[PDB]
Amino acid sequence: KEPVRFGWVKGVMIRCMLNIWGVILYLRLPWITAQAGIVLTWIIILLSVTVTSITGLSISAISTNGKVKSGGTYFLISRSLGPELGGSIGLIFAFANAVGVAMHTVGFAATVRDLLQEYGAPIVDPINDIRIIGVVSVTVLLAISLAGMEWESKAQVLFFLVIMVSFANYLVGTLIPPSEDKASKGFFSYRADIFVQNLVPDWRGPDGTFFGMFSIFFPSATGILAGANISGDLKDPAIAIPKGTLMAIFWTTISYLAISATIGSCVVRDASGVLNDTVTPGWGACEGLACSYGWNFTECTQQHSCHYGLINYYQTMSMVSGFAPLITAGIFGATLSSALACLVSAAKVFQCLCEDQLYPLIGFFGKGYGKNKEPVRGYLLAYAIAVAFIIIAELNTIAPIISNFFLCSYALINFSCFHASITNSPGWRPSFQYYNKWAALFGAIISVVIMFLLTWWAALIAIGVVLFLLLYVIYKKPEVNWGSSVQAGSYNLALSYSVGLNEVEDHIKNYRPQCLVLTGPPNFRPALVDFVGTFTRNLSLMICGHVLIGPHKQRMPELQLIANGHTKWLNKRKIKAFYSDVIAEDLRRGVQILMQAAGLGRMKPNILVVGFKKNWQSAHPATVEDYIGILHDAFDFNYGVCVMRMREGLNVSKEEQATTIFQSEQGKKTIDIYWLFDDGGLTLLIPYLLGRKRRWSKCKIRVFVAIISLLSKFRLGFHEVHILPDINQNPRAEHTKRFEDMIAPFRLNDGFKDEATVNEMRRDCPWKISDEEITKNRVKSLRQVRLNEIVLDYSRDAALIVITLPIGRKGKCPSSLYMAWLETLSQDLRPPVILIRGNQENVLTF
Amino acid sequence: KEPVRFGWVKGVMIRCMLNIWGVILYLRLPWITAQAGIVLTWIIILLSVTVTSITGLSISAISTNGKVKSGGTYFLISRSLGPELGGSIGLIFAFANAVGVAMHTVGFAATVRDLLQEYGAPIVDPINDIRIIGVVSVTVLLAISLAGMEWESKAQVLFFLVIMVSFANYLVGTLIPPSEDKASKGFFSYRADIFVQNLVPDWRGPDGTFFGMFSIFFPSATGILAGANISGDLKDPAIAIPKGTLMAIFWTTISYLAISATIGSCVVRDASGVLNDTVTPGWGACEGLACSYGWNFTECTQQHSCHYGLINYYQTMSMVSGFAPLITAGIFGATLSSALACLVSAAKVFQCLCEDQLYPLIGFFGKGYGKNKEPVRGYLLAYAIAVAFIIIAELNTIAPIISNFFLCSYALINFSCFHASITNSPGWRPSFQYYNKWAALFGAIISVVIMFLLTWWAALIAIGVVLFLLLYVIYSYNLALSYSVGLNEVEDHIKNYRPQCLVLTGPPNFRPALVDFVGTFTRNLSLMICGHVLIGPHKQRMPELQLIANGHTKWLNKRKIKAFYSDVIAEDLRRGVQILMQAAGLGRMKPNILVVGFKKNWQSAHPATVEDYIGILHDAFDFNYGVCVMRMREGLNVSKEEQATTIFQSEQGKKTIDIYWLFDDGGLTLLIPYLLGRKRRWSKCKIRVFVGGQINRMDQERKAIISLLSKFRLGFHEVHILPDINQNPRAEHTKRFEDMIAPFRLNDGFKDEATVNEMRRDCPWKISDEEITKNRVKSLRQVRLNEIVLDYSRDAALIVITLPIGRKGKCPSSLYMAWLETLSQDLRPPVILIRGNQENVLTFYCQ
Amino acid sequence: NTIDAVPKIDFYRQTKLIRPTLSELHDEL
Ligand SMILES: Nc1ncnc2c1ncn2[C@@H]1O[C@H](COP(=O)(O)OP(=O)(O)OP(=O)(O)O)[C@@H](O)[C@H]1O
Ligand SMILES: Nc1ncnc2c1ncn2[C@@H]1O[C@H](COP(=O)(O)OP(=O)(O)OP(=O)(O)O)[C@@H](O)[C@H]1O
Ligand SMILES: CN1[C@@H](CSCC(F)(F)F)Nc2cc(Cl)c(S(N)(=O)=O)cc2S1(=O)=O
Ligand SMILES: CN1[C@@H](CSCC(F)(F)F)Nc2cc(Cl)c(S(N)(=O)=O)cc2S1(=O)=O
C-alpha cells in the first residue's frame, strides 16, 4: 500500500525517446535528404544534436546535487537560481506544454482526416473535421492520464512498441526486389550509383535552402526533458535522469542518421508514377540513372512536372515499406505519445509552482487528490487550454512563439549550471562529473542566438513575457530562502574585494570618517542612528554597537535570533550600517572590546559617537566615572569623539518605525560652528559633509572663531566667519552661582592638606572634588559658562550647533568636574548640539 | 581664476539644437515629403519626437535631483541598477560618441569632395579624398576643442548663425516668381493644386515604403543629451537643463514640420530639366499638372526616366534658394557642429569613467592633465578612435549598431528612473513638475521595440557587447564597502555554509605551518583572520605599534596568502583571545572556527599555562565555535631574505588522508578534508574513513556508512571499521599514561567533593583520585585508539581525529591535556583534531 | 540526552532522535 515508482528504462529513457520521435521522422526527413543530400543532412542532424547534448549534460549535472521532489524542471531551476528567475520560467514552461498538447493533437487529427478522405467518406467539413477529431482525442488522453500514473506508463509502452514495429516494417520493405508499380515511383531495391548521386545537394522551390532545412528540423530534436519532469515518481532521480536522458539522445540520433542514409540510397529524386514509362528499344534518349534499370522518366525531368520521387512525394517512406498501414500506425503513436507526455508535464510542473506562493491567485490549482496526490485541477486547466487552442485549429503561426518558450528554458537550464559551477559554494557537489562550465555558457548563448535566427519577432514576445513575470516577482519579494547560487555569489563577491583592500597601504590622502556608534538596541535611540547615517552613507563605515551587561558569559543561540531582529530593523529604514554586540560585566569594558577588535583589516572605525548622559545628576556617582572613562579610553586608543545631545532626550523607550528630526527638510536655518582648537579638522568636516546632503543643502554654515588664510586654502566653501567676543570676561553672577551649586554635592570641605593625606582620604572614591582643584581650575570653569552664554545669544534659533569638546587632564582633574563642564557648556539650547574633537590628524587633505 | 559657466540659451538650448540638426534636413527631407506626402511625413515626425521628448522628460527629472558632474550620466544606472551596468553603459555611450565624430566628419568630407569634383581638379581617387580630408578636419576640431571650452562655444555660435542664414536664403527663394530655368526643373511658386496633389503618398523604388522613411528619419531626431553631458559647466543645471532641452526639441520639430510643407507646396514630383518643354498650342492634349502652367512633362511620366523633380533630385532644395552656396554653407555648419558636440561629449564621459572608483576597469589616468583640468587624455582617446574609424571610410555598415548603442542607453536611462521611483529608493526625490514613472516605463518599452524593429541582428550585437562587459567584470574601499553591506540582506542557508577561521598564529612568521595549512583550503573560499595578542600593559596606536602591524601584513602579502592580520592587547593570552572571538569581523564575515597549535612542552612549563590553554578551548566551546588543534612532530614555532618553507607547499602525491570519524559533530570533521582535496597538492590523495562498530553487525553497518557518505556526494574512497576500541591497551602503554599523569595527581586518599575544593583552590589543575577513577574507561580509550592509529596510519599524509570533549567541573585541565597528548603521540605525519559545534554543515536536500 | 553519539543517518533527515547539543555535552551537571 505504497505509491509506485519507476526504474530508469520505463521512466526516463522510454519517455524521452517517445517525446523526441515526432512526425518529421516520417513525413519530412526523406524530403530533407533529397533536398540537401546525405552528407549535408548528416551535418544538420549532428549540428542540431550538439545543443541538446549540451543541455542534457547541464540538466544532468543540476539534478545530481541533492534530493529531487515533484515539479521536475521547475524544481531544478528554481532551487538553483532562486525564485526570481525560477518562477518566471516555470509559468511559461507549463503554458508551452499545454499548447504543445494542442499542436500535437492537431497533427494526429490531420493524419486521421487525410486517412478518412480517401478510404471512405469525410465527416462534416474539411476544417471542422480537425476540430471534432482533436477534441475527442484530447478527451480520451485526459481520461487515460487522469486514471493514474501506472496506466499512462502502460500506454507509453504500447506506443513505443508500435513505433518499433513501424521501423522494422520499413527496413524489411526496403530489402525486397521492387515490384513494377513500386519501381515506377522511384524505388529500386539497393545499389551504389543512387547513393553516389544523392550525396550532393539539389535545391528546388522557395523553401529549399540550408537554413530552410535547419528551421524545419531543429524544433524536432528537442523534447529531452520529458523524464526529468516526473522526477517525483522516479525511485532514484540521481541515477535515472543522467542515464535515461543521455541514452535517449544517443538512440534517437542514431535513428535519424540511419533513416536518412537508408532512404537516400534507394529512391531516386525524380520518377513519374505511370506504368507505361518502360523503355522502348531504339528511341530518343535517357535522362539519368533511371534508364540503366529499364525505366524512362525523361518527360518529367525535362518538364519538372510530376508527382513521385524523393522530392515530389512526401509519403515516400510509406510506399517503400512492406505494408503502409503500419507506417500510419507509427505516425499515430508518434503524435499521441508527445501529446500525453506534454499533458503530464504541464500539470506536474504547475502543481509545484502553485505550492510555492509566488503568484497571487493561481494557488487554487496546487491541491492533490488521492494517495499519490495527482493534480486533478492542473490536468483540467491544461485540458481547457488545449481545447481552446484546438477550436482555433490553424496553429501555423502560433508555433514559432511556442517553440521559443522552450528555448528560454534551454538558456536557463544551461546558465544555471554555469553560474553554480563558477561560484563553487562548499556544498556545490554534483556526482555527475562529466560537464564543463564553458560548454554550458556556450549553450546558453546559442539557445538565444537560435531563438532569434528562427524568427526575430517571436523571440521578442517570448523575452517580453519572461521579463514581465520576472519583474513582478522582484517587486513583490516573496520569502523563500532556498539557498540558491545567486545568494552564494554575494559572499565571495564581497570577500574578494575585502581581501583586495589589503594591497593598498595606509596613506594620509585616504582619510575617511569611520564611525563606531554606541546606540544600544537600535530601537531605543533612532535619533542617533539617523544623524550618523546621514553623512556616512555611500562614503564610509558605521557600526551600531551594543553591550549586553550580564554575567552569563555564554553565547546562546537566542542571541543570534535577536541579532537577526536588529539587523532586519536596520534594513527596514534602509540604513547602511552593521550591527555588533558583545558581552561584558559593565558598559565601559564592552566598548573596549569593540574598539580593539571590530573591523576587517583596513576597514575599521576611527570615530566614537556617543549620546549624552542626561540623568547624571540623579544617578549613582560611580556611573559618571564609567561614562568619562569611555571618553578617556577613546582618546587613548587614538580615536575621535563626538558627544551628541538633545533637549528632550535620545532614549525613546523611556506597527511602524519612529520618525525623528534628522529625516525631514530643514531649509532656511543656520548651522552654527564654534572653532576653538585646531583638532586637525574633524570639527569642520562633519558639518561640511552634512551640508552637502539635500536635506541640509539650503542651510547657512556659519563659523565663529590668519584664520581666513587657514580656512579658504582647503576650498571648503563656508559662508561666514567671525571672531567670538571676549571669552575671557567675567560672566554675570547668577549663572556662576548656578554652576557652583550644581557641583556642590561633589564638594569635600577639606580646607588644605598635604597631597599624601588628601589621597589617603580619597582612596575610597575618586569622583569627589577637593577645594585645591576647584580653586586651581576655576578660570576655565568660568570660561565654559561664559561661552554657553555667548552661544545662547547668537545661536538661539539655529538648526544644528557644533562646539568643541574640552579635554580634562587625567590625574589633574576628576571626572565630576569634566562632566560638569560638559553639562553647563550646552544647556538650555533648543536644537541638536554636538561636541567634536579630532585626534590631531590632517583630515582636510581629503 | 574662477571657472567659466554658461547659461541656458548658450550651453544647453543652442548646443542641443546644433546636435539635433544634421544633413537629413537638407538632403533627405524633401525626398521623404515627395514619397510619403505632407500628412504622413508629419505623422513620421511627430511619432518619432514622442520618444525623444519622453527621454528628455526623464533627463530633466534626473537633473533636478541633486548635483552631478560632467559625464555623470550613467550615475543613475550605476546607483539604481548596480555599478556594473553603470560603468558598462557609460563605456558604450562614450564609444558611440567617439564613432559618431567620424561618421559626421565623413559626411563633411564627402560634401567637400563632391564640391571639388565640380569646380576644380581632383588630385587623387574619390575614396582617399575622404580619408585625406576627414583626418585634417578632425584634427582642427581637436585643436579648437582642446583650446578650452570658451573657444568651443564661439565656434558653436558661428555654426548657428550659418544655419540661420541658410534658412533665410531658402525661405526668401520660394516667394520669388519662378524663373524660366528654375521652372523647367519643377519649381513653381506656392499654388494650391500642388499642395493638394502632394498631400497623399506616391511610393516608388526599392526602399519606398513607410518603414523605410521612418528608418531614414528617426535617427536624425536624437542627440538631446548634448547639453546634459556638461552639467558641470552650467550656472544652475536644475533650472537650465529642463528649460533648454525641452525647447531645443520643440523648435527643431517646428523647423522640420515647416520645411516639409513649404517645399511640398512648390515643386512637382517629376520634371525634365530641359528648356524645350514650352507647350505648343493645338498639339493634341497635355498630360500631368504642369501643362496648366506652360510646361509638358509627358515623356518622363510615361517612361519614368527623368532626373529632376522632388522625387528624383535630392538637391531640389539647393536650387529653390536665392543663392546656392549658402545652402552648402548650411551643410558645413550642420555637419561640423554635430562632429564637435560628439567630440566634447565623449571626452567628458571618458574622463568621468577614468575618475570613477566604483568602476576600476578603465582607469589609466596618472598625473593631472591641464591647469583647468581639461580632459586632455579623454580628448586624445576620443580623437584616436575617431581617426581609426575615419581611415576605414566605409561606415554605412557600422551605422546601425552605433545607432543602437544609443537606444540601449535611452532604454536603461528611462528604466532606471522607473525602478528607483517604484522601489522608493532613498536619495531619489526629483523635484520636477512633469515626471511620471509610467511615462518613463513606456519610453523604455518603446526604445527596445524600435531598437529591434530597425534591424534585429544589429540590436543583438549591441546587447551582446554589453553583456560581455557585464560578465567580464563580475568574474577599492568604496567597492568593498558596498558589497559587504550587500551581505546584510542575503540570509544564511545550510547549503551555503562556509568555514571561516580565526587562526591563532602569533607573529605570522613564527608559525608558517598554521598559516600555510589554513590558507590551503580557505583560499578563494572563505574568511581567515590571523590573530596576535600582545601580552602586556595597555595603550595603543603608538607610532611603533601600527608600523609593526604593517610589517606582518606585508609578510602575508609576499607569501601570497589571502588573510587579515589583527592584533589586540591584553594581560594574558586567554583574555586577548576572548576579545578576538567576540568582536572580530564585519557583519556576516565573522569567524566561526578557532584553530590553534599544540602545546609542545606542556609537561615542562608552569601548570597555570596549561590551565589557561585548556580554558581557551573551553571558551571557544562557550561561544559556539568549532575547534581544530594542529600538532606537528618537530614543532610549529620556527624561532625556537627568504621566507621559510613548510611541507604544505609541496605536492603530496598519491598518499592517503586518513579520517577517524568517531563522534557525529555535524560534518566538520569531514568537510575540512574535502575542501583540502579540491587543491592541486592534495588532488591526487586517497581519503580513507574509519568508524567504530561491532563484531557481529560489521557489514550491515559498513554498508550504512558507505550509503551515508554517498548522499553527501563527498567522494571518499575507502571505508573501514574498527571493532576493537573497547579493549584494554598493552601494559607498558597504560603504564606510560599513568606515569605521565603522576605529577598532577592530587593523592588525597578518598574524600567527598565538599572538601576537595578546599585544597584545590591553590592549584585548580590537580586531579583528585576519586575523579581519576570515574574517568578510567575514557582514559584507556585514548591509549587504545592511539595504538590503532599507529597500526594503520603510520605512513599517511594527514590524519584527522575527532576532539574529545570534557565537561566543565568534571575533568581538570591536566586530564584533558593528557588525553590530547595521548591521542597523537609518537606519530610522524601532521595530526589534526577537529570538533564541530553539533550543528549540521552538510545536507541531502535542495531546499 | 547527554552521551556523545556515533554517526547515524537519523540526525540528518527531515520529517527519530536528536543529536546532543553543544551545551548539553559541555555545561555542568
Ligand atoms: N547597553 C549599551 N550599549 C551600548 N551603548 C550604550 C548602552 N547604554 C548606553 N549607551 C550609550 O551611552 C550613552 C549614555 O548612556 P545613558 O544611559 O546615560 O543614555 P540614556 O540615559 O539611555 O539616554 P536618555 O537620557 O535619552 O535616556 C547612551 O546614549 C548610549 O549612546
Ligand atoms: N601571543 C600569541 N598570540 C596569539 N596566539 C598565540 C600567542 N602565543 C601562542 N599562541 C597560540 O597558542 C598556542 C599555544 O602554544 P604555546 O604558545 O602555549 O606553546 P608554543 O610551544 O609556543 O606553541 P607552538 O607549539 O605553536 O610553538 C600556540 O600554538 C599558538 O597557536
Ligand atoms: C516537439 N516539442 C518541442 C517544441 S517545438 C514543436 C512545436 F512546439 F513548435 F510544435 N520542445 C519540447 C520541449 C520539452 Cl522540455 C517538452 S516536455 N514534454 O519535456 O516538457 C516538449 C517539447 S515539444 O514536444 O513541445
Ligand atoms: C546624430 N546622432 C544620433 C545617432 S545617428 C546614427 C549614427 F550617426 F550614430 F550612426 N544619436 C546621438 C545621441 C546622443 Cl545622446 C548624442 S550626444 N552628443 O549626447 O552624446 C549624439 C548622437 S549622434 O550625434 O550620434
Side-chain angles (χ1 to χ4, degrees), chain B residues 618 622 662-664 806-808 835 838 840 844-845, chain C residues 2 4-5 7 9 12 19-20 24 26-28:
Chain B
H618 279 299
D622 283 339
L662 303 157
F663 306 128
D664 179 275
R807 204 172 285 268
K808 300 176 196 168
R835 193 55 187 248
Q838 308 295 110
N840 298 345
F844 307 147
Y845 307 99
Chain C
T2 181
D4 210 356
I9 180 55
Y12 301 89
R19 175 202 285 113
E24 304 196 357
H26 195 226
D27 286 329
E28 287 102 328

mmCIF file of all heavy atoms in Angstrom, chain B residues 618 622 662-664 806-808 835 838 840 844-845, chain C residues 2 4-5 7 9 12 19-20 24 26-28:
data_model
loop_
_atom_site.group_PDB
_atom_site.id
_atom_site.type_symbol
_atom_site.label_atom_id
_atom_site.label_comp_id
_atom_site.label_asym_id
_atom_site.label_seq_id
_atom_site.Cartn_x
_atom_site.Cartn_y
_atom_site.Cartn_z
ATOM 1 N N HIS B 618 37.799 25.779 26.225
ATOM 2 C CA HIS B 618 36.537 25.813 26.952
ATOM 3 C C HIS B 618 35.732 27.063 26.621
ATOM 4 O O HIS B 618 34.499 27.025 26.635
ATOM 5 C CB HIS B 618 36.790 25.724 28.454
ATOM 6 C CG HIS B 618 37.028 24.331 28.944
ATOM 7 N ND1 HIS B 618 36.089 23.332 28.831
ATOM 8 C CD2 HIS B 618 38.098 23.773 29.554
ATOM 9 C CE1 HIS B 618 36.570 22.216 29.347
ATOM 10 N NE2 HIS B 618 37.788 22.457 29.794
ATOM 11 N N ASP B 622 32.135 27.716 24.465
ATOM 12 C CA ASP B 622 31.077 28.550 25.020
ATOM 13 C C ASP B 622 30.528 29.557 24.023
ATOM 14 O O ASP B 622 29.370 29.956 24.148
ATOM 15 C CB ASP B 622 31.576 29.301 26.251
ATOM 16 C CG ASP B 622 31.652 28.426 27.472
ATOM 17 O OD1 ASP B 622 30.976 27.382 27.491
ATOM 18 O OD2 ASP B 622 32.381 28.784 28.418
ATOM 19 N N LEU B 662 34.722 9.414 14.692
ATOM 20 C CA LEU B 662 34.223 8.654 15.831
ATOM 21 C C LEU B 662 32.869 9.162 16.305
ATOM 22 O O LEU B 662 31.921 8.382 16.428
ATOM 23 C CB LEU B 662 35.240 8.688 16.964
ATOM 24 C CG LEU B 662 36.610 8.163 16.545
ATOM 25 C CD1 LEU B 662 37.671 8.709 17.453
ATOM 26 C CD2 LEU B 662 36.628 6.655 16.556
ATOM 27 N N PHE B 663 32.757 10.458 16.578
ATOM 28 C CA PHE B 663 31.531 11.059 17.080
ATOM 29 C C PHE B 663 30.965 12.023 16.050
ATOM 30 O O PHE B 663 31.704 12.756 15.394
ATOM 31 C CB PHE B 663 31.777 11.803 18.387
ATOM 32 C CG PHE B 663 32.436 10.972 19.441
ATOM 33 C CD1 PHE B 663 33.572 11.422 20.083
ATOM 34 C CD2 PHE B 663 31.924 9.739 19.789
ATOM 35 C CE1 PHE B 663 34.180 10.661 21.052
ATOM 36 C CE2 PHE B 663 32.527 8.974 20.758
ATOM 37 C CZ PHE B 663 33.656 9.434 21.388
ATOM 38 N N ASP B 664 29.642 12.028 15.923
ATOM 39 C CA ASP B 664 28.959 12.869 14.943
ATOM 40 C C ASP B 664 28.849 14.283 15.491
ATOM 41 O O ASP B 664 28.083 14.547 16.418
ATOM 42 C CB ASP B 664 27.586 12.304 14.609
ATOM 43 C CG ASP B 664 26.841 13.153 13.609
ATOM 44 O OD1 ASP B 664 26.194 14.129 14.026
ATOM 45 O OD2 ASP B 664 26.913 12.860 12.400
ATOM 46 N N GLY B 806 35.252 17.544 27.116
ATOM 47 C CA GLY B 806 35.233 17.341 28.556
ATOM 48 C C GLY B 806 34.306 18.335 29.232
ATOM 49 O O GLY B 806 34.323 19.523 28.915
ATOM 50 N N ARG B 807 33.509 17.838 30.168
ATOM 51 C CA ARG B 807 32.526 18.668 30.842
ATOM 52 C C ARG B 807 33.204 19.606 31.831
ATOM 53 O O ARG B 807 34.204 19.257 32.461
ATOM 54 C CB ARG B 807 31.507 17.794 31.567
ATOM 55 C CG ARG B 807 30.179 18.466 31.805
ATOM 56 C CD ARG B 807 29.168 17.492 32.357
ATOM 57 N NE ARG B 807 28.674 16.574 31.341
ATOM 58 C CZ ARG B 807 27.597 16.786 30.601
ATOM 59 N NH1 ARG B 807 26.880 17.889 30.723
ATOM 60 N NH2 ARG B 807 27.223 15.864 29.720
ATOM 61 N N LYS B 808 32.654 20.811 31.957
ATOM 62 C CA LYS B 808 33.154 21.748 32.952
ATOM 63 C C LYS B 808 32.947 21.179 34.348
ATOM 64 O O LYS B 808 31.880 20.650 34.663
ATOM 65 C CB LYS B 808 32.441 23.090 32.843
ATOM 66 C CG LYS B 808 32.557 23.810 31.526
ATOM 67 C CD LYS B 808 31.699 25.062 31.583
ATOM 68 C CE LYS B 808 31.426 25.640 30.214
ATOM 69 N NZ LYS B 808 30.360 26.678 30.260
ATOM 70 N N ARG B 835 36.594 19.318 15.972
ATOM 71 C CA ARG B 835 35.320 19.132 16.657
ATOM 72 C C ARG B 835 34.348 20.210 16.216
ATOM 73 O O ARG B 835 34.504 21.371 16.595
ATOM 74 C CB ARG B 835 35.487 19.181 18.175
ATOM 75 C CG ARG B 835 34.269 18.688 18.918
ATOM 76 C CD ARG B 835 33.938 17.313 18.436
ATOM 77 N NE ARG B 835 32.688 16.799 18.968
ATOM 78 C CZ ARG B 835 32.611 15.789 19.819
ATOM 79 N NH1 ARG B 835 33.695 15.221 20.314
ATOM 80 N NH2 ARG B 835 31.415 15.335 20.178
ATOM 81 N N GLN B 838 28.212 20.745 16.798
ATOM 82 C CA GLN B 838 26.975 19.978 16.961
ATOM 83 C C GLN B 838 25.811 20.584 16.178
ATOM 84 O O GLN B 838 24.660 20.523 16.605
ATOM 85 C CB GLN B 838 26.610 19.844 18.437
ATOM 86 C CG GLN B 838 27.713 19.308 19.330
ATOM 87 C CD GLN B 838 28.097 17.893 19.029
ATOM 88 O OE1 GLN B 838 29.179 17.628 18.525
ATOM 89 N NE2 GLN B 838 27.219 16.966 19.353
ATOM 90 N N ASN B 840 24.426 20.927 11.885
ATOM 91 C CA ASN B 840 24.667 20.367 10.564
ATOM 92 C C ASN B 840 25.350 21.383 9.659
ATOM 93 O O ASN B 840 24.983 22.558 9.628
ATOM 94 C CB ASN B 840 23.354 19.912 9.935
ATOM 95 C CG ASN B 840 22.674 18.824 10.723
ATOM 96 O OD1 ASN B 840 23.275 18.197 11.588
ATOM 97 N ND2 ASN B 840 21.407 18.591 10.426
ATOM 98 N N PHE B 844 21.402 16.670 2.593
ATOM 99 C CA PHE B 844 20.963 15.871 1.449
ATOM 100 C C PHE B 844 20.177 16.698 0.452
ATOM 101 O O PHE B 844 20.273 16.471 -0.753
ATOM 102 C CB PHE B 844 20.039 14.730 1.864
ATOM 103 C CG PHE B 844 20.564 13.849 2.926
ATOM 104 C CD1 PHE B 844 19.694 13.272 3.823
ATOM 105 C CD2 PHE B 844 21.898 13.568 3.022
ATOM 106 C CE1 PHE B 844 20.145 12.451 4.797
ATOM 107 C CE2 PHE B 844 22.352 12.738 4.000
ATOM 108 C CZ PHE B 844 21.480 12.185 4.890
ATOM 109 N N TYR B 845 19.360 17.618 0.936
ATOM 110 C CA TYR B 845 18.249 18.142 0.167
ATOM 111 C C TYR B 845 18.679 19.344 -0.665
ATOM 112 O O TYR B 845 19.850 19.724 -0.696
ATOM 113 C CB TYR B 845 17.104 18.478 1.110
ATOM 114 C CG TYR B 845 16.730 17.322 1.994
ATOM 115 C CD1 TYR B 845 17.184 17.245 3.295
ATOM 116 C CD2 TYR B 845 15.943 16.295 1.519
ATOM 117 C CE1 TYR B 845 16.857 16.189 4.094
ATOM 118 C CE2 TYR B 845 15.610 15.236 2.313
ATOM 119 C CZ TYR B 845 16.069 15.186 3.599
ATOM 120 O OH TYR B 845 15.733 14.122 4.393
ATOM 121 N N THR C 2 22.687 13.063 26.950
ATOM 122 C CA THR C 2 23.937 13.621 27.444
ATOM 123 C C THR C 2 25.178 12.857 27.018
ATOM 124 O O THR C 2 26.277 13.264 27.402
ATOM 125 C CB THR C 2 23.915 13.707 28.974
ATOM 126 O OG1 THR C 2 25.144 14.280 29.433
ATOM 127 C CG2 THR C 2 23.751 12.327 29.580
ATOM 128 N N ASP C 4 27.720 11.329 23.994
ATOM 129 C CA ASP C 4 28.068 11.636 22.617
ATOM 130 C C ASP C 4 27.745 10.461 21.702
ATOM 131 O O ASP C 4 27.995 9.299 22.031
ATOM 132 C CB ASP C 4 29.546 12.000 22.512
ATOM 133 C CG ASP C 4 29.823 12.977 21.388
ATOM 134 O OD1 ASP C 4 28.880 13.321 20.645
ATOM 135 O OD2 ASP C 4 30.984 13.414 21.252
ATOM 136 N N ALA C 5 27.197 10.779 20.534
ATOM 137 C CA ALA C 5 26.651 9.788 19.624
ATOM 138 C C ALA C 5 27.602 9.526 18.465
ATOM 139 O O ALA C 5 28.191 10.451 17.903
ATOM 140 C CB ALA C 5 25.296 10.241 19.078
ATOM 141 N N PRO C 7 28.254 8.313 14.517
ATOM 142 C CA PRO C 7 27.485 8.803 13.368
ATOM 143 C C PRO C 7 26.286 7.920 13.062
ATOM 144 O O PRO C 7 26.361 6.693 13.130
ATOM 145 C CB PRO C 7 28.497 8.771 12.221
ATOM 146 C CG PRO C 7 29.805 8.703 12.851
ATOM 147 C CD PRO C 7 29.652 8.035 14.158
ATOM 148 N N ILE C 9 22.421 8.053 10.426
ATOM 149 C CA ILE C 9 21.665 8.710 9.370
ATOM 150 C C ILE C 9 20.502 9.515 9.935
ATOM 151 O O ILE C 9 20.005 10.430 9.271
ATOM 152 C CB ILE C 9 21.186 7.639 8.374
ATOM 153 C CG1 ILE C 9 20.382 8.236 7.224
ATOM 154 C CG2 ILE C 9 20.364 6.587 9.087
ATOM 155 C CD1 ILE C 9 21.103 9.300 6.486
ATOM 156 N N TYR C 12 20.450 13.617 10.214
ATOM 157 C CA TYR C 12 20.478 14.495 9.056
ATOM 158 C C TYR C 12 19.188 14.493 8.251
ATOM 159 O O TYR C 12 19.103 15.228 7.264
ATOM 160 C CB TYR C 12 21.637 14.115 8.134
ATOM 161 C CG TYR C 12 22.994 14.176 8.789
ATOM 162 C CD1 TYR C 12 23.512 13.078 9.449
ATOM 163 C CD2 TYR C 12 23.759 15.328 8.744
ATOM 164 C CE1 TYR C 12 24.742 13.127 10.044
ATOM 165 C CE2 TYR C 12 24.992 15.382 9.339
ATOM 166 C CZ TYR C 12 25.475 14.277 9.987
ATOM 167 O OH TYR C 12 26.705 14.310 10.587
ATOM 168 N N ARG C 19 20.433 14.929 17.955
ATOM 169 C CA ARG C 19 21.841 14.968 18.317
ATOM 170 C C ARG C 19 22.035 15.839 19.554
ATOM 171 O O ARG C 19 21.415 16.902 19.665
ATOM 172 C CB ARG C 19 22.667 15.518 17.158
ATOM 173 C CG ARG C 19 24.132 15.704 17.457
ATOM 174 C CD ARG C 19 24.729 16.715 16.513
ATOM 175 N NE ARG C 19 24.931 16.165 15.181
ATOM 176 C CZ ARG C 19 24.265 16.547 14.103
ATOM 177 N NH1 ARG C 19 23.335 17.481 14.162
ATOM 178 N NH2 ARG C 19 24.541 15.979 12.938
ATOM 179 N N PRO C 20 22.866 15.420 20.507
ATOM 180 C CA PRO C 20 23.063 16.228 21.712
ATOM 181 C C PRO C 20 23.608 17.604 21.371
ATOM 182 O O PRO C 20 24.491 17.752 20.527
ATOM 183 C CB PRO C 20 24.068 15.411 22.526
ATOM 184 C CG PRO C 20 23.934 14.036 22.023
ATOM 185 C CD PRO C 20 23.587 14.141 20.581
ATOM 186 N N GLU C 24 24.623 20.714 26.115
ATOM 187 C CA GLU C 24 24.327 19.506 26.877
ATOM 188 C C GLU C 24 25.588 18.695 27.143
ATOM 189 O O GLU C 24 25.731 18.095 28.213
ATOM 190 C CB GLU C 24 23.289 18.673 26.132
ATOM 191 C CG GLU C 24 22.024 19.447 25.826
ATOM 192 C CD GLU C 24 20.862 18.558 25.456
ATOM 193 O OE1 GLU C 24 21.054 17.332 25.389
ATOM 194 O OE2 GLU C 24 19.760 19.086 25.210
ATOM 195 N N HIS C 26 28.638 19.986 27.348
ATOM 196 C CA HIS C 26 29.709 20.807 27.896
ATOM 197 C C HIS C 26 29.370 21.454 29.228
ATOM 198 O O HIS C 26 30.243 21.558 30.091
ATOM 199 C CB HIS C 26 30.089 21.893 26.885
ATOM 200 C CG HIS C 26 31.391 22.562 27.181
ATOM 201 N ND1 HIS C 26 31.551 23.928 27.140
ATOM 202 C CD2 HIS C 26 32.594 22.052 27.527
ATOM 203 C CE1 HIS C 26 32.799 24.231 27.445
ATOM 204 N NE2 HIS C 26 33.452 23.111 27.686
ATOM 205 N N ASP C 27 28.132 21.896 29.423
ATOM 206 C CA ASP C 27 27.780 22.601 30.643
ATOM 207 C C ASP C 27 27.742 21.643 31.830
ATOM 208 O O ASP C 27 27.667 20.422 31.681
ATOM 209 C CB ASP C 27 26.438 23.304 30.482
ATOM 210 C CG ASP C 27 26.534 24.532 29.613
ATOM 211 O OD1 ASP C 27 27.606 25.171 29.606
ATOM 212 O OD2 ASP C 27 25.542 24.862 28.934
ATOM 213 N N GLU C 28 27.788 22.220 33.028
ATOM 214 C CA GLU C 28 27.901 21.444 34.250
ATOM 215 C C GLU C 28 26.608 20.682 34.538
ATOM 216 O O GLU C 28 25.517 21.052 34.098
ATOM 217 C CB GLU C 28 28.233 22.349 35.433
ATOM 218 C CG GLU C 28 29.645 22.880 35.447
ATOM 219 C CD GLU C 28 29.722 24.312 34.973
ATOM 220 O OE1 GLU C 28 28.902 24.696 34.118
ATOM 221 O OE2 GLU C 28 30.597 25.057 35.458
#
